[model samples]
Target: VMEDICKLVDAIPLHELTSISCAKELLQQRELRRKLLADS
Candidate 1:
């Protein structure tokens, strides 16, 4: 999952991906997914 997610993250263009909000959203989603997976 991390590998696939990293691919998706990588697909984002440099400028927008580097923007704080964009990176924040990805980081938030990654954390959420980690927690959910842990619970399962």
Candidate 2:
């Protein structure tokens, strides 16, 4: 169960939280997630 928690964190993330960049990448990633959810 705890292992699933770790996977979920990495599976969907704000790239900024991953220390990649702020706002820019996070926004794009969020949009991508939106499309993915709509497909579901």
Candidate 3:
């Protein structure tokens, strides 16, 4: 699951991850999780 979540992080667009809170909010969604395990 950790890898799966990491995959989501890896998918983040470069412009959106400039802050800790921004990152946290990005990972806290079920839809976002679906994005995690999907193809790029």
Candidate 4:
């Protein structure tokens, strides 16, 4: 599920992805996913 989400993130336009705020949001989401993965 996390890997699939990454593919969607990868499809985002590079220009938009470069924004710091967007990166921060993604970072938070990544951490959440990491927690779930760690639990499993």
Candidate 5:
């Protein structure tokens, strides 16, 4: 299940990930996740 979630994150554009910390920040945002869920 964790691997599947990693695959989902992998599907995200590289441009959205500036750094390791930035990637983590994006992943932790509830609003952004909700938006992504709605969009997908």
Candidate 6:
């Protein structure tokens, strides 16, 4: 399941998705994602 999710998420176009979304998907954390974007 984790591997499949990683594969699917890996397919996301970083240029197409918002940096926040792309990074969050990679990191797999909603709060951490928000925190990163917020800090930036």
Model 3: per-residue Cα lDDT over 1-40, one tens digit each? 5777665666776576665565556556645656665966
Compared to the true structure, candidate 2 yields what TM-score?
0.42
- Which 10 successive residues of model 6 have the least lDDT summed? 24-33
- TM-score for each of the candidates: 0.43, 0.42, 0.39, 0.42, 0.33, 0.36
Against the true structure, candidate 6 reaches a TM-score of 0.36
True-vs-predicted CA distance for residue 11, candidate 4, Å: 15
**Candidates ranked, most accurate by TM-score first:** 1, 4, 2, 3, 6, 5
| TM-score for predicted model 3 compared with the true structure | 0.39
- In terms of lDDT, model 6 sits at 0.56
> What is the per-residue lDDT of model 1 for residues 1-40, given as tens digits with 9 covering 90 to 100?
5588665754666566666655766666666766777995
Summed over model 4, clashes come to: 0
Q: Identify the candidate with maximal lDDT.
A: 4
lDDT of 4 by residue, 1-40 (tens): 5588675764677577776666867756755766787896
Candidate 2 structure quality by residue, lDDT tens digits, 3-39:
4553454465544365655655555655676577699
Scored by TM-score, the top model is 1
Q: Which of 1 and 5 is the better model by lDDT?
A: 1
Give Cα-based local distance difference scores for all models. Answer: 0.65, 0.56, 0.63, 0.68, 0.64, 0.56
- Count of clashing residue pairs in every prediction: 0, 0, 0, 0, 0, 0
Who is ahead in lDDT, 1 or 6? 1
Better of 4 and 6 by lDDT: 4
Model 3 score (lDDT)? 0.63
**Candidate 3's error at 5, in angstroms?**
0.4
Give candidate 5's whole-model lDDT: 0.64
After superposition, which runs of candidate 3 have C-alpha atoms over 4 Å from their true positions? 21-40
Candidate 5 structure quality by residue, lDDT tens digits, 1-40? 5556765775676675665676656666634666777985
